[PDB]
């Protein structure tokens, strides 16, 4: 109940937390860096431009 | 203190090598659940004796 | 980070030792109280005996009982004095533990701050290489 | 009788503690499943992120 | 590190809200000491949050 250093419950939570926190933080940070780059941002804008022209073409195709 | 300085350097080197091997998440998780269940059984036996 | 990690492990073990001392102090207070309680109970029994002795007509026994009560009272007084001194020490120990609990949390916060500055310094070093 | 009453109270406290302990262990089992999923996702993400 | 501090700060804020609810509950309960203790805990949390 007090929570001794050698107690299994206290030790397990601490060990699990350190490993879990580092892994989660690192994965999120790595993903963010890719997003930060200008080229990636440009691609998203290009994609938006790309979908609308196709839709217009699709409308023309399905018009008759 | 000279002894204190020596102790810190020796302890740090030893601790770093040791922690990495046992820091894997999967091994730690399996060990923790098994241990608590065993403890409960032991506690119950002690409680049972008191009740008796 | 290595210096910080070693320090954190060390402080936790020290706290447990302090807790054990506090428990002993708590036990000591309880033990003195039990003795004091026992003395009071003993005094009551002695008082009953003295009254009984008077009815019996044995004057010497009654006088002896009174002397015993006085000795018990003195012992009780000593125990009470000891308890008061012990209580002040116990309060200080309890206060120290509370202060220590606040301190360990602060130490954890300090490590995060220390880690951030070190990383920044490393980044500066990379610029020099370029 | 006096001894029995004190002992009985202690026994009752122990029983209460056991119930509290039972709740805690059950929670831990649930946590492991959640933890495993998070770890797997991070590992996959790291390899992808580097590329 | 920034995310971790934010999470801790967020956790502290969440903890404070829980503490506030408990203090209100404590007043309804009539236990004055518990409510006072909760307020002290909130102050400590606030100080920690400020440091963060």
Numbering used by the authors:
A (entry chain IC): 156 to 219
B (entry chain B): 1 to 52
C (entry chain A): 26 to 155
D (entry chain B): 105 to 155
E (entry chain G): 53 to 104
From the paper:
Proteins that perform these functions include Vipp1/IM30 in photosynthetic plastids, PspA in bacteria, and ESCRT-III in eukaryotes. Here, using a combination of evolutionary and structural analyses, we show that these protein families are homologous and share a common ancient evolutionary origin that likely predates the last universal common ancestor. This homology is evident in cryo-electron microscopy structures of Vipp1 rings from the cyanobacterium Nostoc punctiforme presented over a range of symmetries. Rings have an inner lumen that is able to bind and deform membranes.
Reconstructions were also generated for the other six symmetries and complete ring models built. Rungs are maximally constricted at the top and bottom with internal lumen diameters of 14 nm and 15.7 nm, and widest at the ring equator between rungs 3 and 4 with an internal diameter of 17.5 nm. This unique asymmetric curvature is a feature of all Vipp1C11–C17 ring symmetries. The analysis of different ring symmetries, ranging from C11–C17, provides us with a view of the structural flexibility that enables Vipp1, PspA, and ESCRT-III family members to perform their functions. Furthermore, as each ring comprises between 5–7 rungs stacked together to build a dome-shaped architecture, these asymmetric structures provide us with a glimpse of the structural features that enable filament tilt in the context of an ESCRT-III-like polymer. Based on the Vipp1C11–C17 models, where helix α5C is positioned at the tip of the spike, α6 helices likely coat the ring outside surface and do not contribute directly to polymer formation. Consistent with this, Interfaces 1 and 3 linking the top two rungs were poorly resolved in Vipp1C11–C17 rings, indicating a weak interaction once the limiting geometry is reached. When membrane was modeled into the Vipp1C11–C17 structures as a 4-nm bilayer, sequential constriction was observed with the membrane lumen reaching ∼3 nm within Vipp1C11.
